Protein: Cis-3-chloroacrylic acid dehalogenase
Organism: coryneform bacterium
Amino acid sequence: PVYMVYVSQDRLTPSAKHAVAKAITDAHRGLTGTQHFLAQVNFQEQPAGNVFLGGVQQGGDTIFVHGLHREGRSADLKGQLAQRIVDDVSVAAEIDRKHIWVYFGEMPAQQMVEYGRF
Amino acid sequence: PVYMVYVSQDRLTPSAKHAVAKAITDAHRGLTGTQHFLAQVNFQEQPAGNVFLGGVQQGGDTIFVHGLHREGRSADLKGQLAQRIVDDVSVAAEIDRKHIWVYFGEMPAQQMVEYGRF
Amino acid sequence: PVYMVYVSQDRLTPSAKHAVAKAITDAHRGLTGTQHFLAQVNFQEQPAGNVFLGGVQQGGDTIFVHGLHREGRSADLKGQLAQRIVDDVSVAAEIDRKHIWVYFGEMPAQQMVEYGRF
């Protein structure tokens, strides 16, 4: 998979970035088998105030996780995975769960090339 | 929904960022009912010159709006929504309509978690 | 199409950015016909160390190309396109092929508005 992680600049220390990457990676690994290859977590930082909810400028604690997945997993499994991401990122990023949005996009596995794939 | 908004650094003043977020949010709200919960607009700024069209470096006025939506809306409705976004962002960002690209991606609602959802 | 290109800050010189944009644009053009309109390549730079693979912080050479496409192309064609992108970006960005990830997302053409489309 690739997890694009949208966070405000400097909210995550180097240690926290590692912790959040671990939380997401371990979540994915925990809910998949040996078919799993490698999870990428790609942090995308922007200055605080670049997020608006209902038109209202936010203070910088929001995290949006956009997970790019292969097709085929059940709704129940994806639900468990999103839940685990919310729970574990909440701890790693030191934020209330309400600050976390998680969206999954699915693609045919054939058009997902990793580290020189298929 | 989540609207990722790709703009060049400093093109939008704080007031313009609010205006563009309002334009997008109001567009979505105007074409949905009470099932609508909350629209996120997430600005992603990069230095001018990071956009290439047909291999040609652009001057910084381009805006790409990547809207992440639930599945199920009609082609006609999505068309109206994209059109309204182009029209209203053109005004808010003080740019010619030609500078605006709008793409919508759709996901099963179940794998869209907002502010601690489903 | 829109190609979002996630790279580490300063890895690509202005000339290299042009070269990578050319590589991606020419790849798309080479595998499409006159129905093709215009390819956008949109560079998204972040400080080196914002990419984690299997929880391990990377040194900054990774490039993730997220291609946003219309629906309808064959698996074989998409495979050729991803392969060409990997090969040609490897040269343009002066990196080993292993550093390149390429994912394609597909949308109904009707909800892809370019430069004031449909």
About this structure: Residues 2-118 of chain A form a domain with the Macrophage Migration Inhibitory Factor fold (CATH 3.30.429.10). Chain A is about 30% helix and 30% strand.
